[PDB]
């Protein structure tokens, strides 16, 4: 899925990933020690799965 769409889904930083989860329908794949920080400050976001 990602290699077909590298100009669209592969963001350039962790901040462009969090904003596209918010402003769009998107399922950014971030490492689990950043998700524990973001999903406590922001309350819109969650950690899907293990």
């Amino acid at each position: 899925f990602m290699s077909s769409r590298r100009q669209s889904v592969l963001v350039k930083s962790n901040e462009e990933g969090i904003q596209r989860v918010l402003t769009s329908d998107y399922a950014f794949l971030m490492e689990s020690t950043t998700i524990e920080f973001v999903t406590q400050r922001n309350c819109n976001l969650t950690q899907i799965g293990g």
């Binding site: 077909s4 100009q7 669209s8 462009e16 904003q19 402003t23 769009s24 329908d25």
Partner: protein, 175 residues
Amino acid sequence: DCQFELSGADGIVRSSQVEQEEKTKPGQAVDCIWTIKATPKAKIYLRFLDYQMEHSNECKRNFVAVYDGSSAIENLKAKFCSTVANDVMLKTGVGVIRMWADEGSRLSRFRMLFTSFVEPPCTSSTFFCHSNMCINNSLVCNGVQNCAYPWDENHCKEKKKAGLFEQITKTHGTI
């Protein structure tokens, strides 16, 4: 001698334009030129609506090339002759999309959508999609994607919200 000089905002590029406008006849090799001259002070984002080759995975008898700037072999952005065409993003406001096709590979067809855009900090008369887009505000609710993921096409449907007032009709509003 096609030379489909297209310009302005969002237009359509159709491979059937050579058949609708009698530039070639069925039964010969075609070689068209689709110049896509931008709005003043802009850049061009090609995206592929339809793309289907008669002889896939073979560049010697059909392909679609997306020459940007002017036509020269140096600035060849992408040369598609396989099954899928990925959406390129040109650097100038001018591109020289062609299509080669052999007599046998005549049924090969494509359909694109070129869109003018500027730098990130948009203003009035410009809508902002992310990743370097300043598409026109006419392109919002155009019914087409003029960006990435359909961001210009959202919150653009408003009919009614009701209960039994929704069904005052040939449903139970008659009974």
